[PDB]
């Protein structure tokens, strides 16, 4: 993976490049260097995360490290909060065309989740220019 | 004739209506036509036609020709009451400005009314108009401001006072507290939004120089863990747009930094009655977290005074301090690390500069986020809790060692009593970053410094290169010798053989010649390039002679204050009063806000004897008392009233001197026998430490 | 005649008024006199005179003689509307009950009205009366309750339904949510306060036994640091009065614990519509923190169902858990200690009893406050975060090892399917404290246990010694052989030679004779002392035969639950459903509350195939599925709807069995090809673990 | 100080018994075993605290240990809060006749402080049967 653009940036392309499937691929967390559980690999692909290359090696993130560092980023790098309507006015774009991730798990918000944000007047948060929301899994009490 | 078939008025048509309605002694048709066309937005769009379609001088003549009486002046009052609600929702929902830009006309017509200044519009007419103007689109506001920027200072003054007394009246008329806020008062909010348009008309209409901008401040890279996260999200390439800025700043393209000399002094836009009633704890909340009907006045910082702006910055740093508390707790919980919620700074009293240099440099590399923690200073040997008193002591100590003549960092000017960056200081970029960090740390930790800088230093900190105008404060003697050249009527080439080469005296005494141009010795100074030579001369000393020293100084200041709204809230002239304090020692305001403990009361016999002594103190002894009790001899922003001093009883009468808890501005006062004994011990206490 | 000079009425005076106003065909004077005397409190005080001065049977005859029509029944409706506001503020401000206790009369007169039950009083009349009654002083309420306690069950039922439908009507009539609470609704609050009077009339009017009380539970001593603080404040001698109790409990002198058989079942006092709308997060706040116009329904726990009471206890334990989080953070901050916000419990799977015994015993001595921390269980070797799944696994494991026959702690009864304390268990007081702690820990940490106990155990836990009535559930066979003696018509001395000496069979098989009296072999059983022998026989087995085993068991349960409102909120019959769960597996309610993740939805093809499989499951396979997914085979309080299960997608089709995250009731379901494959893998998954 | 009742329970009596004054007496904190500062001795006497005897030796408390353990007691042993009016109804006594200490520094509340509690509708807190309030020194922001 010496070539920067050639190396896969997503889990399906990485699996195809290594001639393996997401059902059997073996990955390590970029933070804790520990092998990812199978459900963690499935979450990684479901959360549309990017493969991280350290010293020419493909890495992923485990669930606990992802949530920990997302919490740290929310705590230390929070900028401001906006209403979904104000977000659309600022970008002149529908929320469905904006990449908004869950503040906790970094899962890209579905259009239904953004609609719920609009309906309940829940605010979207900005963390170093990244717009974050709350997903259903992390919204439940 | 009623004139019942005319919808648009004209500069001469109102004249003919007035003249035919004058000798007939019945103005009522004129009242009716004015109340008809002025209360209709579409009618006012086509009225008084010719980047605007309304003749500016035409309406001014019409208003002065027609407002001299007492009847029709009421019609304009009532027409504004009807027109405004039909023009506010028209802008809010219909989006009528996008269809045609001629809709801005009616706002020029209304604002040309002289009686808006009068106190009969503050009840119903002016508040409704301001609600409509605050709903103008950004592009519409851009043209209104640019049109308003061409006015004279007196015209801008009338515009500013118009919205100022509306804000003042509504603050006086209504009762605002923590229950009923000012942020949800739409009349004051709208008048503040309208005042912002005049404020930027003041900025873009004055002396604006948008070119002499310093290099973009080096943005500190986030922690390695944060960099890893952005890679996982696929956002490592794209970067954050930057700090919060006013949208009107972008649309106009001119910033208040670029404004050197506004038509009206900026301090005139501060509405004092609003500041005494604002609650900055919740104002800051509406600044960061958008609320449906709550408006942050930090979005319009020109209206806040230094005290209010200081509070809003304090809450921002405080909130960021707490976020570092929660992160360390999570690190101890999840990662099993040690609880370190402090920017721990172990230094030696005899080597404070070197110890703070190695400690703060090491932090700026490994964990640059530690600078956002609450500062904890502890000296070697002496062990104790740092509640703020040690940090105040440390901040005082570093300033003396930094600005001491022997270190060679700064050259002191006796006449101006100001320090300037020493160009002859080499291999000291680490120390210049240290004093930049210390200044940022003092702001972050709410400690004022005894720092004497020319205003050009604070201008350069915000990214404006010093110009010839700034040379007066820094080097007045050389500034005088340079403007004397500027207005020399005779031939400058003949009288004075000065060229584009300058001689600079080193600290040792050996002069080295510097060339402002490529070959300044060859090229002489003539009247044609006389202006350019002064520009290059001023650009060298203020910007290019100290570029490396100031680059490190600016870098260290940035790594502490980059995430703060400091650049947003404060102009460079307001930075000096923020970093330093007031030099005014109003000990009366100190008396009013002083609290008592240990059995003392405002009516205690020793307390009255104490205040009698300190009010008879000289200025030197007042400074000694302030430094001894609060750790600094300078008053905080505002005055000594903000220094909420506490005088606490400390045992019975004795020979022991009074003590002080500098961290909390607490004076520990024994119950001495008499006033003479109290003065002798108090004078002995403050003249020793 | 209008009868305009009479203020007090009489049992026979209303009769003469009615008879003279009957044949004259004009009842209007009767309407006027009733509306005059009933709307006046002082008039009603002297009306229908003779621990009360009003003849009880007199007014009942008067009401039934006079309410048979349709006109005067409206007068009583309107008289109550006027009398109540003049009698509520009269009690609240004037303090009229202290002056004379005869003022309670009017409340008996009003509550004797049969039409109060009717639905024409729920709008205006009954709500106003309940506001007045809730302002009665404690002494006044004591006599009303004692007077009401003499009624029959049917009479008490009418009284209870009267305030129940008022609560039901106001909940239906109004819209209550998190914005507009029920706690600030004074009509419902007053009707709840009035229902409490009927509730205690139900208690003190039934079978009350206040004598057979167990020894006061040993109060755990506070931490050594707390003991030092009380010495500094000079409060080490005086001790805290104890847990919160209802003031009406003290005034009446009878507790719901003392009530064995109330006239009305306690479950009838639960107002279901109120429970579905109550918010226990803020109800608990008003329970602990007094608020001016907010009323806690936890102060009247009889009205809450098991689910609502479980929530209020959960919030109390949760709040106490958080207070332990803040204390450890302060200990790490101030004292520089290690962050330990958990009741860490390292145990071995093969030695779970011994490892938990030494760990929990050591805590109960050194730091008894650690039991108030959130429980963290980790097994040796297997390393992972305990989010609740390991604690649920630990709780299940200890119950099996504790109640296993070989350990000798408990004897299992096949017929009742219940465990009883084994009297032949010696040198096991440490283990009995362990199972008491585990039961308290399961309550504290919101984990249900698979524990089968007779109701007498839960009665003794709250401090009531078992009686002969409790012997039926514990030992039905011996209970049958003892009541058969009770109703033996013949001479018990002649027919059966049983005496005051009993024979107990040991676990080994060797019987040892126990003497209930000093010399029970000498004294035979006669008809005179036949009752006493059964009382001593039942007192021995339930209380004295296992006194040491239960003392340790009760002590361990107390050190975890002493500060909880558990004793306040729950009756002993409600403890079993709190410690254990429902045995009912309503998988339909499980379907409604189930959530989906990983791309699954309620309409996913595999999701519908999944619910089709599990609804066709047998009871045994339903229990296997519950234990596999949630860690326990028992439903929580309420039902499986409270078990907010989550079915999350786990990759594509495969041969891998579905997995479960027991901590969060998450089922990890691969997207299998068909319904047959899904069942085979799901059955393989739950029948293996 | 073998005799329990004979040994002084207050700072002035302890000073008189040792033939010293509060101006010179040397005391150690019962918790940290560290010598009390002079201002700490004056606070101890002003806060009406009781001398604690450990192994037959008189001890006092320092300011930081007192505040720390008062905070711990408030966190872990808090029972419930009452309004001052409800307090008077419960005890049938004026607040001036009730010993209410500051929740933070354990200084007995003055009648003026209890009056302020009544006026601002500030609640009194119960901590193991000890009724606590907020003193002026600890009420300031
Ligand atoms: Zn990891
Ligand atoms: Zn999420
Ligand atoms: Zn101490
Ligand atoms: Zn205090």
Residue numbers in the entry:
A (entry chain B), D (entry chain D): 9 to 149
B (entry chain A), C (entry chain C): 120 to 169, 231 to 869
How is this structure described in the published paper?
Human protein E6AP/UBE3A, the founding member of the HECT-type ubiquitin ligase family, was originally identified as an associated partner of the viral oncoprotein E6 of human papillomaviruses (HPVs). The E6 oncoprotein from high-risk HPV types hijacks the ligase activity of the host E6AP to ubiquitinate the tumor suppressor p5313, leading to the aberrant p53 degradation. The HECT-type E3 ligases have a characteristic C-terminal HECT domain consisting of an N-lobe and a C-lobe that are responsible for E2 binding and ubiquitin acceptance, respectively. Here, by using cryogenic electronic microscopy, we reveal that the structures of full-length E6AP and E6AP/E6 complex are monomer and dimer of E6AP/E6 protomer, respectively.
